């Protein structure tokens, strides 16, 4: 509530480190055009497309604000500081502000274009706090507050999908008009505020394990429980006849002991060597990929269950569609090379989670007897058994922050398979739009739809602030620990900075799990 | 506590719709004979029966009252009203009343029979509130308060099973005498009251989903995560040599995106076409049916996990033993025709739950390399993985209401696989019985068991009342919704009414899931 | 805090039975030598050992106190009394005391040895209440308070493992120095006290089931739900053509009814007959055993999921590595005979848990049609499905009491697969050590490590006391129940006593599950 010559809000950014929590705030500049010429448009897949790539939905004239990525909040120094001293963290509070809003009209009369101020034009903004519109965040889409504060960004367009029977629709499909919501209209001088509180959520495990499930015992003392170790006879003359013999497992026969827990569930995936020539010479993806199909159409499990990337001393094999792959700065979005991308590694969970390329184990599948020898079968898909303990997938400075747990009758582990915190009531989606300004109407009344508007766009500043709780580490380890560092060697340009052309880049992915804990 | 000429209780029936809850009450007339001639009888399976159809137990002279079906409480108009405006519901409170009790003696001297009043005879009634007798409700048995209030019904006989080693018993087996319980004896003039409160239970999802798991994203914006899309070379001269290539999934390649969740667990079942000639010409049931065996004996999963009946545009295939099948009025209980039954459809859960006839997907099962091409295997049985989200089976106007969760150390999803609400402490079983009236004893004392009683039966009125909580719908859908209606076309008789012979019938099954929600 | 001639603490032992809880206390005498000559020693597996039997870790000069076994607390009469009247139990409170501590010096000058008092020598003791050192309890190791109170026992040595890449280590490995902890030093006259409270934990099911999952219904009343029972035609002339026919399942066709729940998850294991000649003539163990591998190395599931040992009337087959095996008194720890060990039976869970030797069932794996007949596949590995109900493994008088649930992001059923109660914060490990007493130092200062100490050991008394909650049984069973008893027949020596040589022995394993309950 001000005039045209008074600024609303200021540029805050920065971050504050307190005793048990950190407040990270960031401000950016945003631009917004008009979408679909102020029209809601039905969108069907295509005539003759693939059965799996079918979809029906709508596209609206509304934009929305995305900040669901760590790099859209944290900074490389702040991230390194957070992960090198903490065993966990989670969000606590959220604040959002829109200000310094300008609506600018555009005129075209020739090859040149002219831009002028339009002080009387409003802008509509509203937040879906009741979670009634479809939630499109948490799908790893583009367009959150660029990692560099100096970058000016663009508000993505909003759209949603619904039930479809092929390329068509069904009566059960829903249509949502976003103008049918109470929304706030604001001019140059007004501003929008919003506050939100996260619900209880488990701390993210920002640490590795210094122990292993299979090696969790005393290396000095035998077990007092007996196990069958021989079926033939040890004594002379009985080595060719059956006789059950029982031993006690000690430090030597350490693989035959009794145990309390089992490794996490498995869903096997194919393996690929980072060297091109070492792989099979065929286009096997989508024909040899672990995929799941529902309603008669297939789909690919890209993240999949949290499972270790490779074994020890491999460093060369990665599962097909088994880990997040990021893009380097200035990389094509279609058929990029292996050296132009950034494949994340989840080896830290080798201790608890089974490796993705290999199997869960073997199970007996017959009744052995004198005539028939015992036979087993390898099992590659494993559900949930009692006593199972596993670890969740790590999050990265560039990765997703949260997701919306679907409103369904059943859940097993609501932790998102792509990233961090799953929330029943996540931060609501803020949607912003430019109100349509009609051009000169006809002098004689006409009932026809008005389809001659004045072309104009908008720009402004958006501030976000999240308060995060931190879990401190108290480890009794004697020797030092592994931590994130910058290489001291000479380089043309330093990491996480701008080049001579002023383009910000991220060289490597950074994971949180660096400190250690005992199982 | 009254005389012989004063009535206890009245006929209430009807239902009341309040702001956030509905009170449904119904009164019926019941008859009760004497069972087993006032004797407890041991019952074994048979000599020479099938191994799977073996059982040992007891049958008592006690009846019991059953009202564990929606049609025994609701009415077609009330049911349609409930399901067309609500997103859920659950039971809150229960009241039960027995009154207007008459004991009538029967005399036979010739082909004719005479019935007289017997004012001094009592009736025993008691409720197992401590859950000590076996719970036989929740097994889809016959004999609850008929759907039509004017119908007079019959109290079913009580019996139970125990451990058996073949047709015989084991020392671990238990015997329960129901006369060994504190019970209330009541004459003509007395009445029995009972009140009960349901424990906390999740709301039943009386809605479908307007979105799908595989289509939950923005149809306009690409993903920023890379995925391997090619193994050969795209450039000329490299189409026959291996080279990993990575792309970004957008609206076109919508089946290759990253996702957070997986469809519910699966347990595959055989498929049957509703057309007889389209099926295989063999007696495959019980020889090609998904069955589970314990203690060395098999058993059939009739409901099975909640899984979609068929794909889109099928409308003709149903799983074998994969959905509830109801009987039409006046239908034989042995080898009825397909047109004389009523097969329920669970297609509403196609969005989340996998189809029953098809598989969960495929999983890689080898280590591909230059020499060996990758190989996958189809998986038809799937356990529980992290990130799994599913939906429960719908309930119907004629279906079961609740069940008793077994008292065991472990549970995964205590929702009954046949129907609605699972309860650790369900409504207790009320048991009623006619006390034995001896005939004239011998003049000289004899220690022999008294086995000459006076033949008589009982009749009375039973009132039930359940208070149910309701969850209102607040949807932002623009277009109208699908709802239950009666066909306006001319017909000989209208649905859910009596015919010229005064026989009440139910033409079709009615499911609760009609409104929609976003995932 | 006393002198040299005043005793600290007394010998309590005994047990008290109160209305709803039992307090079991026991005192023992312990001895303690010096370990590793007061040195921390790195321990690697070996050069050329098996890949699976690889390990890296450390061994310390510290002892620790173990009392994680029922026989180290209860007594045969107390155990029999507990299991013959109770439906459950769990720990409530813990108290621990160390007193009457003497440090004795040893001198060797010839074949003879002399032992003298050393009043000025201290002893170090501390409890890891913050759970920072690796937890080596709960691995079925040797050395808890002997079952007979008169036996004097030996304090086991402490050691731990860490991450290893083969026989070597990795930078992520941790080293813990136990001298780096605040510890209490105590002489002859001082004593150590400790108190602890268990966290909430489910009652242990010390009962069997009088009913079965597959037989949980009324043996007298048919079901009102129809099931496909025939695919051919029953009428004459249609027995060779397809026609779906539906029936109602009653007491006769009791294996084709509808049900609410499924048996627990399965993980098949091989079967062995107790008769040697009836088994296959090969050394199949470890080559036909259900095993799971992680980080590229295998491991054996000795307890495995809680699954029934055998079917009815078998009494001769046991799963390979599927139940706890105890040793008889004076039995060799390497290749003992079948008659010299004690194999526990878990048949009591046949009602709910599937048998270990057999499969979970069969699942359809194709689309049957006119041309192709339906085909099914047997499933031996089963995950977790909705509606699954199972039972946990029984505990024994000689078996483990508790275990430490690993600190991980995910758990399915934290009940240990080897035994009883899983605890996030179990009773902490008390560690005790003899401080090093230097021998005469050189007259001239030398910076070399001091490696000439005085040889001496320690002895003392340790008292433990646990308060346990009890769940009373209120069963309506008429006939008597099965209970534990001692055979009245004449014998050379009675059970659970000492022989002519004063050696205490345990003849048979005792399980808690003796009383019964309905599902």
Automatic annotation (TrEMBL), chains A, B, C:
Disulfide bonds join 72-144. Keywords: Capsid protein, T=1 icosahedral capsid protein, Virion. Residues 1-492 form the Coat protein VP1/VP2 Parvovirus domain. The keyword Transcription does not apply. GO terms for cellular component: T=1 icosahedral viral capsid. It comes from the Viruses. The keyword Amino-acid biosynthesis does not apply. It is found in: Virion. GO terms for molecular function: structural molecule activity. Belongs to the parvoviridae capsid protein family. This is Capsid protein VP1. It comes from Adeno-associated virus 3B. The chain holds residues 218 to 736 of 736 of the full protein.
């Amino acid at each position: 509530a001000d005039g045209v010559g008074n600024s609303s809000g200021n540029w805050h950014c920065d971050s504050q480190w307190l005793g048990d929590r950190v407040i990270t705030t960031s401000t950016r500049t945003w631009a917004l055009p008009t979408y679909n010429n102020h029209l809601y448009k039905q969108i069907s897949s295509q005539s003759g497309a693939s059965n799996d790539n079918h979809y029906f939905g709508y596209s609206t004239p509304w934009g929305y604000f995305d900040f669901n990525r760590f790099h859209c909040h944290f900074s490389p120094r702040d991230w390194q500081r957070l992960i090198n001293n903490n065993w966990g963290f989670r969000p606590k509070k959220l604040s959002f502000k829109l200000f310094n809003i300008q609506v600018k009209e555009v005129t075209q009369n020739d090859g040149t274009t002219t831009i002028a101020n339009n002080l009387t034009s409003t802008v509509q903004v509203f937040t879906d706090s009741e979670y009634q519109l479809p939630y499109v965040l948490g799908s790893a889409h583009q367009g959150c507050l660029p990692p560099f504060p100096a970058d000016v960004f663009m508000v993505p367009q909003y759209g949603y999908l619904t039930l479809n029977n092929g390329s068509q629709a069904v009566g059960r499909s829903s249509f949502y008009c976003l103008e049918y919501f109470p929304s706030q209209m604001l001019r140059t001088g007004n501003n929008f505020q919003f506050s939100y509180t996260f619900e209880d959520v488990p701390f993210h495990s920002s640490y590795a394990h210094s122990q292993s499930l299979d090696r969790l015992m005393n290396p000095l003392i035998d077990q007092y429980l007996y196990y069958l170790n021989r079926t033939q006879g040890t004594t002379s003359g009985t080595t060719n006849q059956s006789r059950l013999l029982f031993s006690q497992a000690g430090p030597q026969s350490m693989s035959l002991q009794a145990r309390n827990w089992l490794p996490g569930p498995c869903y096997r995936q194919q393996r690929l060597s980072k060297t091109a020539n070492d792989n099979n010479n065929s286009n096997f993806p989508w024909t040899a990929a672990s995929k799941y199909h529902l309603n008669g159409r297939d789909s690919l499990v890209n993240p999949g269950p949290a499972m270790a990337s490779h074994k020890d001393d491999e460093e060369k094999f990665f599962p097909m569609h088994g880990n997040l792959i990021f893009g380097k700065e200035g990389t094509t979005a279609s058929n990029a090379e292996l050296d132009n991308v950034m494949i994340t590694d989840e080896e830290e969970i080798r201790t608890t989670n089974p490796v993705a390329t290999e199997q869960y184990g073997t199970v007996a599948n017959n009744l052995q007897s004198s005539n028939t020898a015992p036979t087993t079968r390898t099992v590659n898909d494993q559900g949930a058994l009692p006593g199972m303990v596993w670890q969740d997938r790590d999050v990265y400075l560039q990765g997703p922050i949260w997701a919306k747990i679907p409103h369904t009758d059943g859940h097993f582990h609501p932790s998102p398979l792509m990233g961090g915190f799953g929330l029943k009531h996540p931060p609501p989606q803020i949607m912003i739009k430019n109100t349509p300004v009609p051009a000169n109407p006809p002098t004689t009344f006409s009932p026809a739809k008005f389809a001659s508007f004045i072309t104009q766009y908008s720009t402004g500043q958006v501030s976000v602030e999240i308060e995060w709780e931190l879990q401190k580490e108290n480890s009794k380890r004697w020797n030092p620990e592994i931590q994130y560092t910058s290489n001291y060697n000479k380089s043309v340009n330093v990491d996480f900075t701008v080049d001579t052309n002023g383009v910000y880049s991220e060289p490597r992915p950074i994971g949180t799990r660096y400190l250690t804990r005992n199982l």
